[PDB]
């Protein structure tokens, strides 16, 4: 049984970062050579394991998270980071054991006029627990007046679109990210 890593990396759509997908991987054999020998993965950093030696190890579960962020923000998909992605969208644990890979997805995820499908959380009153992610849409109260479920002044929709534009510098382009956890 090949572990369905093709379904994750060669997926048609990816998820928004505030709503990142997770695929549990159980009861199979996975070929990690096909990953480190890919000219496409601009980021391939591994924590607690060595990338080559990943075909010689066994775990009781493997988790596969996928989402889209800005290249400037792949810096935050690492243990011990802060910022709007790490704090309000996707948080890794300090004791992470796994790998994080990313690759420029300008050709599939940006268009002229801007692709607005991808979203991130802008407003949250408290930092996110690791692997603990909320799908909520309640508008954010930034004043002392209750908002009563109406978007307005000091009463902001908590999500914001990346508006991926094709022309921008590299740091602003969409990057698809896959996080492998080993437990």
């Amino acid at each position, epitope marked *: 049984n090949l572990c369905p890593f093709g379904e994750v990396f060669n997926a048609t759509r990816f998820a928004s970062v505030y709503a990142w997908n997770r695929k549990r991987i159980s009861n199979c054999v996975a070929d990690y050579s096909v990953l480190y020998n890919s000219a496409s993965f601009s980021t391939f950093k591994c924590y607690g394991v060595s990338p080559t030696k990943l075909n010689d190890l066994c775990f009781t579960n493997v988790y596969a998270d996928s989402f889209v962020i800005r290249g400037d923000e792949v810096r935050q998909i690492a243990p011990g980071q802060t*910022g*709007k992605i790490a704090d309000y969208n996707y948080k890794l644990p300090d004791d992470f054991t796994g790998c994080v890979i990313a690759w420029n997805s300008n050709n599939l995820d940006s268009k002229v006029g801007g692709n607005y499908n991808y979203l991130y959380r802008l407003f949250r009153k408290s930092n996110l627990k690791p692997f603990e992610r909320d799908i909520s849409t309640e508008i954010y*109260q930034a*004043g*002392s007046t209750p908002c009563n479920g109406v978007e307005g002044f000091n009463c902001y929709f908590p999500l914001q679109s990346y508006g991926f534009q094709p022309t*921008n510098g590299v740091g602003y382009q969409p990057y698809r990210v896959v996080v492998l956890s080993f437990e």
Partner: antibody
Amino acid sequence: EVQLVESGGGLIQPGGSLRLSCAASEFIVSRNYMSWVRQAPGKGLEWVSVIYSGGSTYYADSVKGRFTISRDNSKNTLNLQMNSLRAEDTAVYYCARDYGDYYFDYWGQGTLVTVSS
Amino acid sequence: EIVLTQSPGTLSLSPGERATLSCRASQGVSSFLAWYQQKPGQAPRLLIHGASSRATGIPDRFSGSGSGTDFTLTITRLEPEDFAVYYCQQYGSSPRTFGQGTKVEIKR
């Protein structure tokens, strides 16, 4: 009805300490990105420090290790503790409501911090 | 850090005339640009964000253009209270940084 009011500016020795305070009226510092921005007399605008809605803080490289941003929730106050004050640091200091660590959409009147011997 | 260069440094026009301010960036900042207005003795005031979105209560004669490294702010029909200093501010990277300003003085 919305309002930001700074205080705590004044004259301080080089290498002294000073604690700026910004009192918010209608809108809650604890739930907001809050920032400090400064302006030397007859000069441009420099971003100093920010505090995220959820707690994270960031600083300009010129003030790391010397400034500390924080907030008093029971008094809806933004604060800046400034130690090891230099000449460079003489400026008008503004608190600003910061929209998502992007731009500054509401500013206080400012307070003047003169650091001279 | 993104270095923000504003020109012209000063600009003498007459009420009713058209103003075109420029702000060029040391490298790409996409659409992540804001413009501010500062009168002497008081705090700056946000005019547009995102290179082209008017802030709340900002009259329509103010308008923003540009993407990448070349941005312009345009006042259509200069009113006697539009004469101040205008700053650009990028929020695409690094420390957030401001331009050095542009004084819009009335010519008489």
